[PDB]
Curated annotation (Swiss-Prot):
InterPro entries, A to Z: Allantoicase (IPR005164), Allantoicase_dom (IPR015908), Galactose-bd-like_sf (IPR008979)
Pathway: Nitrogen metabolism; (S)-allantoin degradation; (S)-ureidoglycolate from allantoate (aminidohydrolase route): step 1/1
Reactions the enzyme catalyzes: allantoate + H2O = (S)-ureidoglycolate + urea
Source organism superkingdom: Eukaryota
Name assigned to this protein: Allantoicase
SUPFAM superfamilies, per database record: Galactose-binding domain-like
NCBIfam families, A to Z: allantoicase
Gene: DAL2
Known role: Utilization of purines as secondary nitrogen sources, when primary sources are limiting.
Molecular function in Gene Ontology: allantoicase activity
Record has Translocase as a keyword: no
Keyword Hydrolase: yes
Native organism taxonomy: Eukaryota, Fungi, Dikarya, Ascomycota, Saccharomycotina
Pfam family, one: Allantoicase
EC number of the protein: 3.5.3.4
Amino acid sequence: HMKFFSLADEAEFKSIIISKNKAVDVIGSKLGGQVVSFSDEWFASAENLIQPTAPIRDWYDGWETRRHNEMEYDWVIIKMGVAAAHIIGGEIDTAFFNGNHAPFVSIEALYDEGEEGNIVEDDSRWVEIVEKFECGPSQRHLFVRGNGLTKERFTHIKLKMYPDGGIARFRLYGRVVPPHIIDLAYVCNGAVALKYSDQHFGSVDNLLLPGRGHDMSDGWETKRSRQPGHTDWAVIQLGRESSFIEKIIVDTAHFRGNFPQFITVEGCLKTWVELVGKSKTGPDKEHVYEIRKSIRVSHVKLTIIPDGGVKRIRVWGY
């Protein structure tokens, strides 16, 4: 019942994951995903599986276990960085494991309330959500569950590899369940980056992450453009339709020689209306636009002029 997408068809995969199911990688370290435990890690750390970077050759950039596992499977337990989610799909990348790749993978999940302790492998609450499937050498596998979004919500993921081997990356896509003003554009509140002009370095989904990040690689950055009147833009579905917007924050943290010259922010109800008009931007700073407007919008569009890099956007309201 799992459905797999060719690399040539990643655009269509992203369509389903993001545009239709409003999903994000809920186990990525960049939104606070954490490896809780693992069976084994002999050749290469489990922690590599959730790193934001694409895997590289030169050590192995991945999780790899000892040979001849006497158990049926090796495993890793991962706590999501969001509070809870319904699961739609994922990615397993066996990059550079050319024969010693994981032969088969399955995925289970559970829902835990109290950070009461470190979850164990044989917890009765584990529920299979992706049935066992075959993997190939050194490649990306893009999957969607046959039944679409998981009915129940979950907080923790178990990856099973039968019986042992290597995996470079593991992404798991889910529609976040959000847990008085909030950041309507925050990833943990169900906000998702939908559409973009260009992503040269980083990605638009980085706009909605916790923190101000560490360097340029964890924001959204576009190429140096030359055409007069060029802009770049990013559309964000908010976690909720707004009733009020208090405050918009555009953060150029770490973008020092490549921050946009100007920005605007529009909102719309899914017909775009202005929230922030043309505003001069600076390097490496949180720009705070007080809006204080009773308005009903479902999406925002951030426009950077003519190009450059923004670390985050925050849309405070309710």
